[PDB]
Design an enzyme around this catalytic site. Structure first.
Site, mmCIF file in Angstrom:
data_model
loop_
_atom_site.group_PDB
_atom_site.id
_atom_site.type_symbol
_atom_site.label_atom_id
_atom_site.label_comp_id
_atom_site.label_asym_id
_atom_site.label_seq_id
_atom_site.Cartn_x
_atom_site.Cartn_y
_atom_site.Cartn_z
ATOM 1 N N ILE A 35 -0.666 -14.222 2.214
ATOM 2 C CA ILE A 35 -0.200 -15.064 1.114
ATOM 3 C C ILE A 35 -0.521 -14.473 -0.249
ATOM 4 C CG2 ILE A 35 -0.607 -17.245 -0.045
ATOM 5 C CD1 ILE A 35 1.089 -17.279 2.598
ATOM 6 N N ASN A 88 -6.473 -15.928 3.319
ATOM 7 C CA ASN A 88 -5.042 -16.053 3.580
ATOM 8 C C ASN A 88 -4.317 -14.761 3.217
ATOM 9 O OD1 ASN A 88 -5.552 -16.453 0.729
ATOM 10 N ND2 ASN A 88 -3.970 -18.042 0.594
ATOM 11 N N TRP A 104 -9.696 -9.337 2.117
ATOM 12 C CA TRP A 104 -10.358 -9.789 0.900
ATOM 13 C C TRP A 104 -10.303 -11.316 0.756
ATOM 14 C CZ3 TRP A 104 -7.881 -5.175 1.370
ATOM 15 C CH2 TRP A 104 -8.503 -4.028 0.854
ATOM 16 N N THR A 105 -9.338 -11.935 1.446
ATOM 17 C CA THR A 105 -9.069 -13.365 1.284
ATOM 18 C C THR A 105 -8.899 -14.070 2.629
ATOM 19 O OG1 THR A 105 -6.674 -13.105 1.052
ATOM 20 C CG2 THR A 105 -7.930 -13.004 -0.972
ATOM 21 N N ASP A 133 -1.489 -14.722 -3.704
ATOM 22 C CA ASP A 133 -1.991 -15.709 -4.655
ATOM 23 C C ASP A 133 -3.172 -15.132 -5.432
ATOM 24 O OD1 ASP A 133 -4.214 -15.729 -2.899
ATOM 25 O OD2 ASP A 133 -4.059 -17.894 -2.534
ATOM 26 N N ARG A 136 0.812 -1.216 0.000
ATOM 27 C CA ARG A 136 0.000 0.000 0.000
ATOM 28 C C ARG A 136 0.847 1.270 0.000
ATOM 29 N NH1 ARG A 136 -3.431 2.494 4.650
ATOM 30 N NH2 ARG A 136 -4.671 3.942 3.394
ATOM 31 N N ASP A 177 -13.897 -3.143 -6.432
ATOM 32 C CA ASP A 177 -13.550 -4.515 -6.784
ATOM 33 C C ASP A 177 -14.652 -5.101 -7.669
ATOM 34 O OD1 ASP A 177 -11.149 -4.763 -5.028
ATOM 35 O OD2 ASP A 177 -12.637 -4.798 -3.412
ATOM 36 N N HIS A 229 0.527 3.840 -3.109
ATOM 37 C CA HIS A 229 0.087 5.217 -2.891
ATOM 38 C C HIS A 229 1.177 6.216 -3.212
ATOM 39 C CE1 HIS A 229 -3.905 4.884 -0.592
ATOM 40 N NE2 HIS A 229 -3.804 4.042 -1.619
ATOM 41 N N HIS A 250 -4.962 -6.601 -3.606
ATOM 42 C CA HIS A 250 -5.842 -6.855 -2.466
ATOM 43 C C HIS A 250 -5.859 -8.311 -2.028
ATOM 44 C CE1 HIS A 250 -8.167 -2.876 -3.260
ATOM 45 N NE2 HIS A 250 -6.990 -2.722 -2.665
ATOM 46 N N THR A 251 -5.200 -9.220 -2.744
ATOM 47 C CA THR A 251 -5.046 -10.595 -2.261
ATOM 48 C C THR A 251 -4.293 -10.651 -0.949
ATOM 49 O OG1 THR A 251 -4.659 -12.820 -3.067
ATOM 50 C CG2 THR A 251 -2.861 -11.257 -3.450
HETATM 51 C C1 HEM Z 1 -8.078 -0.172 -7.854
HETATM 52 C C2 HEM Z 1 -8.493 0.763 -7.050
HETATM 53 C C3 HEM Z 1 -8.142 0.685 -5.559
HETATM 54 C C4 HEM Z 1 -8.917 1.148 -4.571
HETATM 55 C C5 HEM Z 1 -10.270 1.834 -4.665
HETATM 56 C C6 HEM Z 1 -8.305 0.860 -3.312
HETATM 57 C C7 HEM Z 1 -8.871 1.175 -2.090
HETATM 58 C C8 HEM Z 1 -8.394 0.584 -0.936
HETATM 59 C C9 HEM Z 1 -8.917 0.672 0.405
HETATM 60 C C10 HEM Z 1 -10.208 1.465 0.650
HETATM 61 C C11 HEM Z 1 -8.145 0.002 1.256
HETATM 62 C C12 HEM Z 1 -8.252 -0.291 2.778
HETATM 63 C C13 HEM Z 1 -7.487 0.749 3.604
HETATM 64 C C14 HEM Z 1 -7.706 0.529 5.110
HETATM 65 O O1 HEM Z 1 -8.777 0.851 5.583
HETATM 66 O O2 HEM Z 1 -6.771 0.098 5.768
HETATM 67 C C15 HEM Z 1 -7.080 -0.597 0.472
HETATM 68 C C16 HEM Z 1 -6.105 -1.333 1.020
HETATM 69 C C17 HEM Z 1 -5.094 -1.954 0.397
HETATM 70 N N1 HEM Z 1 -4.695 -1.739 -0.853
HETATM 71 FE FE1 HEM Z 1 -6.000 -1.011 -2.286
HETATM 72 N N2 HEM Z 1 -7.145 0.200 -3.610
HETATM 73 C C18 HEM Z 1 -6.972 0.039 -4.936
HETATM 74 C C19 HEM Z 1 -5.910 -0.471 -5.586
HETATM 75 C C20 HEM Z 1 -4.809 -0.980 -5.029
HETATM 76 C C21 HEM Z 1 -3.575 -1.342 -5.767
HETATM 77 C C22 HEM Z 1 -3.374 -1.012 -7.258
HETATM 78 C C23 HEM Z 1 -2.766 -1.919 -4.895
HETATM 79 C C24 HEM Z 1 -1.324 -2.446 -5.089
HETATM 80 C C25 HEM Z 1 -0.997 -3.272 -6.024
HETATM 81 C C26 HEM Z 1 -3.463 -1.979 -3.596
HETATM 82 C C27 HEM Z 1 -2.988 -2.499 -2.427
HETATM 83 C C28 HEM Z 1 -3.649 -2.492 -1.242
HETATM 84 C C29 HEM Z 1 -3.252 -3.262 -0.104
HETATM 85 C C30 HEM Z 1 -2.102 -4.232 -0.022
HETATM 86 C C31 HEM Z 1 -4.194 -2.932 0.981
HETATM 87 C C32 HEM Z 1 -4.121 -3.637 2.366
HETATM 88 C C33 HEM Z 1 -3.448 -2.736 3.363
HETATM 89 C C34 HEM Z 1 -3.318 -3.312 4.797
HETATM 90 O O3 HEM Z 1 -3.472 -4.488 4.936
HETATM 91 O O4 HEM Z 1 -3.105 -2.540 5.721
HETATM 92 N N3 HEM Z 1 -4.640 -1.460 -3.776
HETATM 93 N N4 HEM Z 1 -7.296 -0.148 -0.800
HETATM 94 K K LIG Z 2 -4.369 -14.259 -0.447
#
Ligand code: HEM
Ligand SMILES: [K+]
Ligand code: HEM
Ligand SMILES: [K+]
EC number: 1.11.1.11
Lengths: 249, 249
Positions: free
Chosen positions: A184, A181, A178-179, A186, A37, A207, A41, A162-163
């Protein structure tokens, strides 16, 4: 169309050594999803038309951290500061993108190629370029396509980030993984997306938009059926993301 | 370095006719200072490096009107809408800059040259580019110089636009006119600036900054001593302002 800058041998030594220490640190702290993330960002604010924003170190600035889209990423920045301080030669810009590449690798995902040389820029971009979870396919193409310059294929594969990880009600307001695991890497994000809403698992409206779009849905289907294809397309997209505005963009 | 676009004869007829109706309307409503402010705030958002912002019609958008720097300009926009509707062929971009040119002329100031052809753009620039009244010379050069691309001479002469009008505590928070004759365009702004703080008259910290800067103070002195010189330098600067990003910028 990339032409990557030359960096000194001492710089390349620090990359290699930082990459190994990031593996151990991120694995120990279980913070790979937050570091992915942080990397995303950082990069995701690029606007091709004006060549502003992008992965150039500005997310550590308190003014950019204050963007509401960035809620909780100050934690990420803080976690990394002691380690970064062990690599003073590296740009923050490079360091954060490297952490994102490592986050993906240590959770078992593909090896995203990494090229050093990003410079730390002084000014954060204006707020508001990152995507809105409550919107749909048009919005996604506006942000990934018209601003950042990525492809429809890139949008779906990168959505698969989001996996790993989860939302938190005190950060975005959404809540849960979202998953099943979430440490992990995947294709489970796509598999869950296709099966409906499983109890306890998260689906953002952004999504779900992937399921209704005529270009995005074939891609969700391919990735749910073929994890190798997912990993290939993911690695391509994440490299492009991590290099927006860099070495020609 | 300007190359102004060709416009149709019907377009030029509407300019000429709009210019006369704006004179009568602005004179009747006594709103010349607010219309000058509207024109300036429209233009003043230009950033040469990215070629974004500038006098392209976006100030009528509720999102730009909501910028706190723009408090009270919704009044201006509303006042002009009936008249604009009499000139559907004209861009809002051209119409607002013409109102600013007329505001200056009907209060007795110099005739600023006007060239039509600005197009109405769809997106307002990010908020925060307009100057902060509480800051000083460095800030002024950042905004007028580094962003808009105007000269130190332009900064001082354009500051003289405060020779007409007043602040309002419910709009910026500051209150009152800079001059004893705030509907008369003359060099009185500089004369008051030099004489100290006269009871009842306003000086922003940004005005005062002109007195302490080694480049700006000679200019204040020249203008206080020579209204003709002021009018020449003013007309130059306002044309440049009104044409930022337009016909080459
Ligand atoms: C496509 C449009 C996207 C939207 C609308 C979006 C929106 C969001 C939101 C609302 C969260 C949760 C934040 C929280 O409350 O902690 C999130 C988390 C996250 N996003 Fe996305 N996101 C997008 C794309 C992406 C992309 C392109 C990636 C990287 C490849 C990504 C990686 C992640 C990850 C790894 C989390 C988990 C963070 C944690 O576990 O603390 N996202 N996103
Ligand atoms: K996973
Ligand atoms: C140089 C830096 C500048 C700063 C910090 C600044 C700031 C301000 C402020 C705080 C107000 C009062 C708003 C209110 O409360 O109603 C004002 C008003 C005004 N400004 Fe300036 N301004 C600047 C330059 C300009 C320029 C370049 C022009 C045009 C040539 C201009 C034209 C005016 C006019 C005409 C008013 C009077 C508006 C009325 O009577 O309603 N100003 N400005
Ligand atoms: K006056």
């Amino acid at each position: 169309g990339k032409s990557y800058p030359t960096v000194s041998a001492d710089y390349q030594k620090a990359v290699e050594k930082a990459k190994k220490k990031l593996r151990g640190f991120i694995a120990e702290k279980r913070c790979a999803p937050l570091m992915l993330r942080l990397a995303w960002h950082s990069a995701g604010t690029f606007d091709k038309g004006t060549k502003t924003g992008g992965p150039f170190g500005t997310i550590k600035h308190p003014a950019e951290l204050a963007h509401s889209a960035n809620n909780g990423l100050d934690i990420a920045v803080r976690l990394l500061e002691p380690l970064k301080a062990e690599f003073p030669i590296l740009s923050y810009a490079d360091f954060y993108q490297l952490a994102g590449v490592v986050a993906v690798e240590v959770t078992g995902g593909p090896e995203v190629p990494f090229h050093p040389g990003r410079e730390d820029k002084p000014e954060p971009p204006p707020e508001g370029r990152l995507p809105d979870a409550t919107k749909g396919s048009d919005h996604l193409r506006d942000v990934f396509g018209k601003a950042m310059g990525l492809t429809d294929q890139d949008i779906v594969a990168l959505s698969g980030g989001h996996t790993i990880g989860a939302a938190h009600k005190e950060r975005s307001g959404f809540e849960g993984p979202w998953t099943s695991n979430p440490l992990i890497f995947d294709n489970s994000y796509f598999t869950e997306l296709l099966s409906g809403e499983k109890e306890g698992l998260l689906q953002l409206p952004s999504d779900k938009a992937l399921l209704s779009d005529p270009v995005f849905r074939p891609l969700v289907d391919k990735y749910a059926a073929d994890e190798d294809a997912f990993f290939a397309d993911y690695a391509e997209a994440h490299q492009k993301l991590s290099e927006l505005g860099f070495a020609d963009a």
